């Protein structure tokens, strides 16, 4: 009881850290997603057709 | 950079035979490519290209060939070989032998994608092993001590507690805590029955160590190719964690005897002739490709240490699996049927066991200055104690000398206190060495001939 | 064309087409990453390639570039101090250039660097029009302070010099000679290339006459090897092999050292590659690195099986190249058992008939043909010279079973066995050479050398071997006779056997006086111990026949100072005390013991 009791209250900080870490994900994602979508959509639209390097006439 | 081209899907199945599907009209077939099959009922399976010849490819399907036909089955060629996503987010996760999650967490976001075959470490870049890995088990840490960058098998037999030992090493292992978060475990288990697999998964959650551990489970009725892949996913993860994230990784590979059973089956599916004792002739080069993914390297602070675990038929050390493992690895820890029958746990026999790198792991600044002397003297007393115990049945206890009666007292207290340990009892190397001195103090200090006078002066007397 | 194309892949086996002019056992580069393999079958205009590297991802229609050559070595300046594997990949240059801890698939760095410039001096009296033949030295490169590297015209080359380069600094790719024969011109740089499986030719192969000294008292006295000799040692964990390797490297009368690891454990190979650069020797009163006269071939157990098998052929071809310059070479193979297991795996891939214990039918012929490359020679080509290659091959009998096919073949071939022993290492008896099991068959070839240079030695060796054998017969008698009841002659034998065993056969290599023991110190010590034995025997046998007897107790009580001087002989330091000073002190022990026995008699 002497070893568990105090840290039993302080274990609430794992939830506080979970919400802080998730808030840090929201802040990271919303600042960057437009560059990531602009890059991703550019790679999808830039097609460039080519034949397999082992092809011979 | 990227692979970019659209995939081809074929309905050109020529034939089906055993685990194998044969296709024709395939465009520039690539050896070892991964392919996806869709069955006539819409079920999906996957496989790997086992051979190519002209426009023909033959695919080994991981799941069965049942329900496949030449008309409606389609095969999609992905363009590439098997690569695994890898990241530090894999610690605290459970995966199957194909790297798929089985812990109800999400699928891995890659920090990289790696080829599971790897590459050999350059002999110029590998530096010699050094400090201890502390397993928490006295028969290992005290007398068969394991160096960072060593590879050392546990040799066992069917019905002995080698999975209970492996699980205890996994729960307890770390660095010595002299005077870290840089330690991790990759645990891989091949051909595991559902009772054993549930035990591993349950025991590491229940005893709360998952934040250090990546776990790969391959069950006894999973595809036999997933058993071939399992050590390679595990070691491709250990190579990322050790040589890019600078961790000390412990790798536990469970039943290399189950791995060899799958290797013999993939060899038979290629229509190769059986080699020496029925295993593939190339089984040394195959096992060496697993075991040499280990060591310390120059200029990086991480390492990989391997503990393979093996089951021997007939308790015979001369079978190809333990024999070829002995030529590649550097020591053995031996698990004994007689200690197990005597109800001792862990039933490790210290007389045939050896760690060949023990002198590089132990001593001042790495464990304690007396460790080598205590290990040498405990071995010497036990080897005499077993010889006195044998002659006691010939000459009778009234013919034994006072010194024989000291070895006969040491023998009983060594096995009850040093070797016998709980499955959830964790001893540091310091506790192991202190239990070692309690037993050495049974003798007059003149008997302790393997220990120098300086060590006897500092450690033989008790103190407040 | 130089290109065929991949037709099919099945494990390490590749089938290729448009391969019509490709010869048996040529090397090829397969696919866009250029994986190495060798041609093992021809059929029509198709070839079957055994690929050395992982074939994962190789595609139908991929290029198969053919090299016009079998497996071969680049022979030229840049070999000294180099680390190679069994197929001559430069492991330290691959590390340096790649900045990776791994070896890349299809890596194609040249074994000798083409960007280092070498100081070259021509042979002074070669001119335009000079007639020149294979093995002729036409210039020298100052490679380092120790090895002058002699540039030779290749075997199977001859003609009249049409150009020779002036003194200067040159890349290994620069032409330094041109010659002409039958109106056809050959242009040559400092690097020649030779097939590892072909024996390099010589003017004559000669009997081996001169000792390969190690500085050990055992070995050099009881079990000598010659320059050009062959030796085996037991390759096992506790026995202490390193005394052979380090005495050869630091102290032998070799000019060059080649070391081969041939499928060793990763942590063992790491220990060799750490330790060898740290070894040093004293030359002209200056300390020099061993890596100025040494090259290493290194292979761990996960290198390609083709490299692990090629390794000894790479190492012997390097050894034969320095022999041809007129050097004396020692070659060490770290375990020939790991080489034989690679040969077995290759025969398994080829699906060959499993013969003795699963080893291919040719195993004993491959071992015989390998050890037949050892010897003293008269070199090819004009400046008249002699060289030699001496082979030491470690071998690992399983559980000590010498009936193993590789061990049984090896001890059937080699002329010396130095039986290193775990039991002696556990006694702290170092060097751990077992004198009962060990042998040398060169003792007759060395008879003319010992007669000329030392003259007293062959009798002393013969007596010393008998004393050490008598003690091994007397031991089973002493177990019953209880030591005290033994004859005084035999007490002298037992205690002189102990004197030889503790004070001649043992040699503490960490101590400045005993790191190296020269042969004058070696015969001087033995001469005195055997002189004392003969005088002690003579004193007993003169008196005990009918007079009041002398005893080994009376001798010890009278002569304990002489016996202490005899045990002290090993402490003489060949660097601090001159040859004449040590010899004069060893003569003083002979005078003192003769005086002491004359006072006893």
Give Cβ neighbours of residue C162 (< 8 Å, ≥ 6 apart): C128, C178, C179, C180, C185
Cis peptide bond N-terminal to B118, omega within 30:
no
Structure tokens at C107: 């890596």
A20 φ/ψ angles, rounded to the nearest 5 degrees: -60, -50
Please give the helix or strand (H or E) that residue B190 lies within, else none.
strand B183-192
Residues of chain C numbered 402-461 and touching chain B (CB < 8 Å): none
Q: Give B205-213's long-range contacts (Cβ < 8 A, gap of 24+).
A: B207/B171, B207/B424, B209/B170, B209/B171, B210/B91, B210/B92, B211/B91, B211/B92, B212/B91, B212/B183, B212/B184, B212/B185, B213/B91, B213/B92, B213/B170, B213/B184, B213/B185, B213/B186, B213/B187
- Residues of chain B with Cβ-Cβ distance to C56 below 8 Å are 31-32, 81, 115, 117
Q: Are strands B303-311 and B248-254 parallel, antiparallel or unpaired?
A: parallel
Cα–Cα distance for residue pair C375/B80, rounded to 1 Å = 53
Instruction: Give the gap in angstroms from C-alpha A54 to the nearest C-alpha of chain C.
Output: 5
Neighboring chain C residues of A53 at a CB cutoff of 8 Å: 32
Interstrand relation of C256-260 and C294-297 (parallel, antiparallel or unpaired): parallel
Token pair recorded at residue C198: 């072909």
CB B367 within 8 A of CB B361: yes
CA-CA-CA-CA torsion sign (C59, C61, C64, C65): negative
> CA C447 from chain center: how many Å?
23
Identify the bridge partners of residue B434 per DSSP, sorted by sequence position.
Answer: none
Cβ B67 vs Cβ B39: under 8 Å = yes
Instruction: Give the up-direction half-sphere exposure of residue C481: CA atoms within 13 A in the CB hemisphere.
Output: 13
On the CB side of B130, CA atoms within 13 Å amount to 14
- When divided into structural domains, chain B yields a total of 1
Tokens of C544: 């005990």
C116-188 CATH choice from 2.40.50.100, 3.40.190.10, 3.10.450.40, 1.20.120.1200: 2.40.50.100
Q: Tell me if the bond preceding B260 is cis, omega within 30° of 0.
A: no
- The chains in contact with chain C, meaning 3 or more Cβ pairs closer than 8 Å, are A, B
Token duo for residue C151:
């540039």
Using the structure block, give the residue that is written with the tokens 């590439």: B80
Dihedral in degrees, nearest 10, Cα atoms B54, B58, B59, B60: -150
Among A48, A50, A52, select the one facing B28 at the smallest CB separation: A52
B406: which DSSP letter? H
Backbone torsions φ then ψ of B49, nearest 5 degrees:
-70, 110
Going by their DSSP bridges, the two strands B248-254 and B183-192 should be labelled as parallel
Q: Which of C61, C62, C64 to mutate to test the interface with A (most CBs of A within 10 A)?
A: C61
Residues of chain C positioned with their CB less than 8 A from the CB of B115: 56
Tell me the pairing of strands B183-192 and C158-164.
unpaired
With 0-12 / 13-18 / 19 or more C-beta atoms within 10 angstroms meaning exposed / middle / buried, residue B300 is middle
Distance CA C7, CA C365 (A): 35
Measured in angstroms, the CA of C31 and the nearest CA of chain A are apart by 10
Q: Which two tokens stand for residue B85?
A: 């996503």
Return the residues preceding each gap in chain C, C–N over 2.5 A, or none.
Answer: none
Handedness of CA B293, B297, B301, B305 (dihedral sign): positive
Contact predicate C25/C86, CB 8 Å: no
**Is C15 within 8 Å of C47 (Cβ atoms)?**
yes
**Chain length of chain A:** 57
Is the C-alpha dihedral spanning C470, C472, C477, C482 positive or negative?
A: positive
How far apart CA B21 and CA C280 sit, in angstroms, is 62
Cβ contacts of residue B442 below 8 Å, gap of 6+? B406, B409, B410, B413
Contact (CB, 8 A) for C177 and C153: yes
**CA B221/CA C487 separation, integer angstroms:** 77
Say if the Cβ atoms of C59 and A54 lie within 8 Å: yes
Spatial separation of the C-alpha atoms in residues C63 and C266, rounded to whole Å: 34
Please state the φ and ψ torsions of residue C114, each to the nearest 5 degrees. -95, 10
The answer to whether C390 and C331 are in contact (CB under 8 A) is yes
Residues of B in contact with C94 (CB under 8 A): 122, 124
CA dihedral B241, B245, B250, B256 (to 10 degrees): 20
Query: Distance between CA atoms of B375 and B440, rounded to whole angstroms?
Result: 11
- The residues pairing with C168 across neighbouring beta strands, listed in sequence order, are C120
DSSP three-state, residue C439 = strand
How far is it, in rounded angstroms, from Cα C49 to Cα B52?
A: 15
Contacts of B267 (CB under 8 A, 6+ apart): B274, B280
Q: After which residues is chain A broken (C to N over 2.5 A)?
A: none
- Cα C186 from Cα C290, distance rounded (Å): 37
CA distance C487 to B279: 62
**CA pair distance C37, C32, nearest whole angstrom:** 14
Q: Is B76 helix (H, G, I), strand (E, B) or coil?
A: strand
Q: How far apart (Å, rounded) are the C-alpha atoms in residues A39 and C264?
A: 50
Residue carrying structure tokens 């770390």: B174
Crossing angle for the helix pair B256-269 and B283-291, nearest 10 degrees? Answer: 130
Question: Do residues C582 and C576 touch, judged by C-beta distance below 8 A?
Answer: no
Q: Which residue has the tokens 């300086």?
A: B454
B104: left (phi over 0), alpha (psi -120 to 50) or beta: left
What 3-state DSSP class applies to C96?
helix
Q: Determine the Cα–Cα distance for residues C28 and B110; give it in Å rounded to an integer.
A: 37
| Domain extent at residue B22 | 2-462
Contact B186, B367 (CB under 8 A): no
* CA proximity to B335, closest of B304, B322, B324, B424: B322
The token pair at C282 is: 């004293």
User: Which H or E element spans position C181?
Assistant: strand C177-181
Give the per-residue SS3 of C299-363: CECCCCHHHHHHHHHHHHHHHHHHHCCCCEEEEEECCHHHHHHHHHHHHHHCCCCCCHHHCCCCH
How far apart CA B97 and CA B172 sit, in angstroms, is 24
Residue of chain C whose alpha carbon sits nearest to that of B275 = C348
Q: Could you say which residues from 275 to 314 on chain B have a Cβ atom under 8 Å away from some Cβ of chain A?
A: none
Q: Cβ atoms within 10 A of the Cβ of B137, count?
A: 23
| Preceding-residue numbers of gaps in chain B (C–N over 2.5 Å) | 179
Nearest-Cα residue of chain B relative to residue A43: B4
Q: Are B134 and B141 in contact (CB under 8 A)?
A: yes
- How was this entry determined? cryo-EM
Which chain A residue has the Cα nearest residue C62? Answer: A54
For residue C64, the distance in angstroms to the closest alpha carbon of chain A comes to 12
Interface test with chain B among C270, C271, C345, C353, by most B beta carbons within 10 Å:
C270
Q: Which of B50, B126, B270 sits opposite C266 (nearest CB)?
A: B126
Cα separation values, C542 from C301, C484, C488, C556, C595, Å: 65, 21, 12, 17, 17
Q: How many CB atoms lie within 10 A of CB C56?
A: 18
Q: Which residue positions of C form the known binding site for Mg(2+)?
A: 242, 264, 268, 334
Q: Cβ(B12)–Cβ(B74) under 8 Å?
A: no
What is the spatial distance between Cα C597 and Cα B136, in angstroms, rounded to a whole number?
Answer: 66
Q: Under an 8 A CB cutoff, do A52 and B4 touch?
A: no
Residue C21, min C-alpha distance to chain A (Å): 21
Q: What chains are in contact with B, requiring at least 3 Cβ pairs below 8 Å? A: A, C
Calculate helix-pair angle for C457-481, C488-500, nearest 10 degrees.
120
Backbone angles phi, psi at C95, to 5 degrees: -60, -55
The torsion angle over the Cα atoms of residues C414, C418, C423 and C428, rounded to 10 degrees, is -160
Chain A residue closest to B2 (CA)? A43
Cβ pair B356, B127 in contact under 8 A: no
Q: Which residues pair with C464 in a beta bridge?
A: none
Which chain C residue shows the shortest CA-CA distance from B56?
C8
> Is B4 close to A48, i.e. CB distance below 8 A?
yes
What is the rounded distance in angstroms from the CA atom of residue C303 to the CA atom of residue B122? Answer: 9
Closest CA to B370 of B464, B462, B456, B463: B456
Is B30 labelled a binding residue?
Answer: no
Tally of residues, chain C: 601
Residue C184 structure tokens: 């056809």
The separation between CA B309 and the C-alpha centre of its own chain, rounded to angstroms, equals: 5
Residues 22-41 of B with CB under 8 A from A: 27-28
- The CA distance from B437 to B459, in Å, is 8
Alpha-carbon span C426 to C582, nearest angstrom: 33
- Which residues touch C317 (CB under 8 Å, ≥6 apart)? C73, C75, C194, C196, C200
Best residue in C302, C338, C344, C349 for a mutation probing chain B (most B CBs within 10 Å): C302
Taking each helix axis from N to C end, the angle separating C519-543 and C488-500, rounded to the nearest 10 degrees, works out to 170
Are A43 and B5 in contact (CB < 8 Å)? no
- Is C99 touching B (CB cutoff 8 A)? no
- The radius of gyration computed from the CA coordinates of chain C, to the nearest angstrom, equals 29
- Contact between A50 and B5 using a beta-carbon 8 Å cutoff: yes
Q: Quick one: resolution in A?
A: 3.0
| Residue that has been written with the tokens 């590659």 in this structure | C273
- Which of B30, B51, B120 is the best mutation test for C, with the most CBs of C within 10 A? B120
Binding-site residues of C, in ranges, read 238-243, 264-265, 268, 334, 430, 507, 509
Closest to C86 measured CA to CA, from C406, C317, C372: C317
Residue A56 at interface with chain C, using a CB cutoff of 8 Å = yes
Helix, strand, or coil (residue C558): helix
Altogether, the residues listed in chain B come to a count of 464
Cβ of B28 and A54 within 8 Å? yes
Rounded CA-CA distance C516/C507 in Å is 9
From chain B, the residues in CB contact with C338 under 8 A are 327
Torsion of CA B111, B114, B120, B125, to 10 degrees: -20
DSSP letters spanning B300-342? -S-EEEEEEEEE-GGG-TTSHHHHHHHHHSSEEEEB-HHHHHT
Measured from the Cβ of residue B90, the count of other Cβ atoms closer than 10 Å reads 24
Question: Taking a C-beta distance cutoff of 8 angstroms, is the pair C331, C315 a contact?
Answer: yes
Task: Report the alpha-carbon distance of residue C505 to residue A38 in Å, rounded.
Answer: 81
- Gap between the Cα atoms of C50 and C41, Å rounded: 9
List CB contacts (< 8 A) between A48 and chain B: 4
CB C343 within 8 A of CB C396: no
Measured CA to CA, the distance from residue B173 to residue B161 in angstroms comes to: 18
Q: Quickly list H helices, C439-578.
A: 447-453, 457-481, 488-500, 519-543, 552-568
Cβ atoms of residues B448 and B377 within 8 Å: yes
Chain A: list its partners (3+ Cβ pairs within 8 Å): B, C
CA C253, CA B182: separation in Å to the nearest integer? 50
The DSSP secondary-structure symbol of B153 reads P
B315 Rama sector, left if φ>0, alpha if ψ -120 to 50, beta otherwise: left
Task: Assess contact for B7 and B77: CB atoms under 8 A.
Answer: yes
Tokens 């017969």 — which residue? C473
In chain B, which residue's Cα lies nearest the Cα of C62?
B28
Q: What are phi and psi of C587, to 5 degrees?
A: -70, -35
Residues of A in contact with C60 (CB under 8 A): 54
- Given the structure tokens 């016996």, which residue do they identify? C563
C159: left (phi over 0), alpha (psi -120 to 50) or beta: left
How far is B392 from chain C, CA to nearest CA, in Å?
A: 24
Chain A residue nearest residue C4, CA to CA = A54
Phi, psi at C5, each rounded to 5° = -135, 145
Q: Is the peptide bond before B346 cis (omega within 30 degrees of 0)?
A: yes
CATH classification at residue B266? 3.40.50.12240
- Per domain, the residue ranges of chain C are 2-71, 72-115+189-440, 116-188, 441-601
* CB pair distance less than 8 Å for C91 and B121: no
Superfamily grouping for domain C72-115+189-440: P-loop containing nucleotide triphosphate hydrolases (3.40.50.300)
In sequence order, which residues have a C-beta less than 8 Å from that of residue C340 and are 6 or more positions away?
Answer: C359, C363, C405, C406
Phi and psi at C321, nearest 5°, equal -65, -40
Which DSSP symbol is given to C280? E
How many C-alpha atoms does C554 have within 13 Å on its Cβ side?
Answer: 17
Both structure tokens of B71: 């008309």
Q: Residue C136 and residue C41: Cα distance in Å, rounded?
A: 38
DSSP string, C211-266: B---S-HHHHTTS--BTT-EEEEE--SSS-THHHHHHHHHHSS-SEEEEE-SSB-H
Nearest to B289 among C269, C274, C302 (CB): C302
The backbone torsions φ and ψ at residue C365, rounded to the nearest 5 degrees and listed phi first, read -70, -40
Distance, in Å, from the CA atom of B134 to the CA atom of B193, rounded to the nearest integer, reads 29
Please, are residues C137 and C167 in contact by the beta-carbon 8 Å criterion? no
d(CA C119, CA C141): 6
CB of B117 within 8 Å of a chain C CB? The answer is yes
- Residue recorded with tokens 């030449």: B70
**Cα C464 to Cα C500: distance, rounded to the nearest angstrom:** 8
Contacts of C437 (CB under 8 A, 6+ apart): C417, C419, C421
Q: What stretches of B206-355 adopt beta strand conformation (E)?
A: 213-219, 248-254, 295-297, 303-311, 331-334, 354-355
Considering only CA atoms, which of C507, C529, C536 is closest in space to residue C589?
C529
Residue with tokens 């240059």: C93
Closest to B151 (Cα-Cα) out of C305, C268, C297: C268
What separation in angstroms does the CA of B72 have from each of B44, B55, B146, C409?
Answer: 13, 20, 56, 61
């Amino acid at each position: 009881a002497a070893a568990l009791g105090s840290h039993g209250s302080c274990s609430s900080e794992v939830e506080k850290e979970t919400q802080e870490k998730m808030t840090i994900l929201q802040n990271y994602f919303e600042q960057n997603r437009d560059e990531v979508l602009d890059n991703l959509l550019a790679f999808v639209c830039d097609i460039r057709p080519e034949i397999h390097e082992n092809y011979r006439i | 950079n990227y692979l970019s081209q659209p995939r081809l899907t074929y309905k050109t199945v020529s034939g089906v035979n055993g685990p194998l599907v044969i296709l024709d009209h395939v465009k520039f077939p690539r050896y070892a490519e991964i392919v996806h099959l869709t069955l006539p009922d819409g079920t999906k399976r996957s496989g790997q290209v086992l051979e190519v010849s002209g426009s023909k490819a033959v695919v080994q399907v991981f799941e069965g060939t049942s329900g496949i036909d030449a008309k409606k089955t389609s095969c999609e060629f992905t363009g590439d070989i098997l690569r695994t996503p890898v990241s530090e987010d894999m610690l605290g996760r459970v995966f199957n032998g194909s790297g798929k999650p089985i812990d109800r967490g999400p699928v891995v976001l890659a920090e990289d994608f790696l080829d599971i075959m790897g590459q050999p470490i350059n002999p110029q870049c590998r530096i010699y092993p050094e400090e201890m890995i502390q397993t928490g088990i006295s028969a290992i840490d005290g007398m068969n001590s394991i160096a960072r960058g060593q590879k050392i098998p546990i040799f066992s037999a069917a019905g002995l507690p080698h999975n209970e030992i492996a699980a205890q090493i996994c729960r307890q292992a770390g660095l010595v805590k002299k005077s870290e978060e840089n330690f991790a475990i990759v645990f891989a288990a091949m051909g595991v029955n559902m009772e054993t697999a549930r035990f591993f998964k349950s025991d590491f959650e229940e005893n709360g160590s998952m934040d250090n551990v990546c776990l790969f489970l391959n069950l006894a009725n999973d595809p036999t190719i997933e058993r071939i892949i399992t050590p390679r996913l595990a070691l491709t993860t250990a190579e990322f964690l050790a040589y890019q994230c600078e961790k000390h990784v412990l790798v536990i590979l469970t039943d290399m005897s189950s791995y060899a059973e799958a290797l013999r089956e993939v060899s038979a599916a290629r229509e190769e002739v059986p080699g020496r004792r029925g295993f593939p002739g190339y089984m040394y080069t195959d096992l060496a490709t697993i075991y040499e993914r280990a060591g310390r390297v120059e200029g990086r602070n991480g390492s990989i240490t391997q503990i393979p675990i093996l089951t021997m038929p007939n308790d015979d050390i001369t079978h190809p699996i333990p024999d070829l493992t002995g030529y590649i690895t550097e020591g053995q820890i031996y698990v004994d049927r007689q200690l197990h029958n005597r109800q001792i746990y862990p039933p490790i026999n210290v007389l045939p066991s050896l760690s060949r790198l023990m002198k590089s792991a132990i001593g001042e600044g790495m464990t304690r200055k007396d460790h080598a002397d205590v290990s040498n003297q405990l071995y010497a007393c036990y080897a005499i104690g077993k010889d006195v115990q044998a002659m006691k049945a010939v000459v009778g206890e009234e013919a034994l000398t006072s010194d024989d009666l000291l070895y006969l007292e040491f023998l009983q207290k060594f096995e009850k206190n040093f070797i016998t340990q709980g499955p959830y009892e964790n001893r540091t190397v310091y506790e192991t060495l202190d239990i070692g001195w309690q037993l050495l103090r049974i003798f007059p200090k003149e008997m302790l001939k393997r220990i120098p006078q300086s060590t006897l002066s500092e450690f033989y007397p008790r103190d407040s | 064309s130089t290109f065929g194309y991949v037709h099919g892949v099945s494990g390490p086996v590749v089938t290729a087409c448009d391969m019509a002019g490709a010869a048996m056992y040529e090397l090829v580069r397969v696919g866009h990453s250029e994986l190495v393999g060798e041609i093992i079958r021809l059929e029509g205009d198709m070839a079957t390639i055994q690929v050395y590297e992982e074939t994962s991802g190789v595609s139908v229609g991929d290029p198969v570039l053919r090299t016009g050559k079998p497996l071969s070595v680049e022979l030229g300046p840049g070999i000294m101090g180099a680390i190679f594997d069994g197929i001559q990949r430069p492991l330290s240059d691959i590390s340096s250039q790649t900045q990776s801890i791994y070896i890349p698939r299809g890596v194609n760095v040249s074994a000798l660097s083409r960007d280092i410039k070498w100081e070259f001096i021509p042979s002074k009296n070669l001119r335009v029009g000079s007639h020149i033949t294979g093995g002729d030295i036409y210039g020298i490169v100052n490679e380092n302070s120790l090895i002058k590297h002699k540039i030779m015209l290749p075997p199977r080359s001859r003609g009249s010099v049409t150009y020779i380069a002036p003194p200067g600094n040159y890349d290994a790719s620069d032409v330094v000679l041109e010659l002409e024969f039958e109106g056809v011109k050959e242009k040559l740089s400092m690097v020649q290339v030779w097939p590892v499986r072909q024996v390099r030719p010589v003017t004559e192969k000669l009997p081996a006459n001169h000792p390969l000294l190690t500085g050990q008292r055992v070995l050099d006295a009881l079990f000598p090897c010659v320059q050009g000799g062959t030796t085996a040692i037991p390759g096992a964990f506790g026995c202490g092999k390193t005394v052979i390797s380090q005495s050869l490297s630091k102290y032998s009368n070799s000019d060059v050292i080649i070391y081969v690891g041939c499928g060793e454990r990763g942590n063992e190979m790491s220990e060799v590659l750490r330790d060898f650069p740290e070894l040093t020797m004293e030359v002209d009163g200056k300390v020099e690195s061993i890596m100025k006269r040494t090259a290493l071939v290194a292979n761990t157990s996960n290198m390609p099986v083709a490299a692990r098998e090629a390794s000894i052929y790479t190492g012997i071809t390097l050894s034969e190249y320095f022999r041809d310059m007129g050097y004396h070479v020692s070659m060490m193979a770290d375990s020939t058992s790991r080489w034989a297991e690679a040969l077995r795996e290759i025969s398994g891939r080829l699906a060959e008939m499993p013969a003795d214990s699963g080893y291919p039918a040719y195993l004993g012929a491959r071992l015989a043909s390998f050890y037949e490359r050892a010897g003293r020679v008269k070199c090819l080509g004009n400046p008249e010279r002699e060289g030699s290659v001496s082979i030491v091959g470690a071998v690992s009998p399983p559980g000590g079973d010498f009936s193993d096919p590789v061990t049984s073949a090896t001890l059937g071939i080699v002329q010396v066995f130095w039986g290193l022993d775990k039991k002696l290492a556990q006694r702290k008896h170092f060097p751990s050479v077992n004198w009962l099991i060990s042998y040398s068959k060169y003792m007759r070839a060395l008879d003319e050398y010992y007669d000329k240079h030392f003259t007293e030695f062959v009798p002393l060796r013969t007596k010393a071997k008998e004393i050490l054998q008598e003690e091994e017969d007397l031991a089973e008698i002493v177990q019953l006779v209880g030591k005290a009841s033994l004859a005084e002659t035999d007490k002298i034998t037992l205690e002189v056997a102990k004197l030889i065993k503790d004070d001649f056969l043992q040699q503490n290599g960490y101590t400045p006086y005993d790191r190296f023991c020269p042969f004058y110190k070696t015969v001087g010590m033995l001469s005195n111990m055997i002189s004392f034995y003969d005088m002690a025997r003579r004193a007993v046998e003169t008196t005990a026949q009918s007079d009041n007897k002398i005893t080994w107790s009376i001798i010890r009580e009278h002569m304990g100072e002489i016996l202490y001087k005899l045990s002290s002989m090993k402490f003489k330091d060949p660097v601090k005390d001159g040859e004449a000073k040590i010899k004069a002190d060893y003569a003083q022990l002979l005078e003192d013991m003769q005086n002491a026995f004359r006072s006893l008699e």
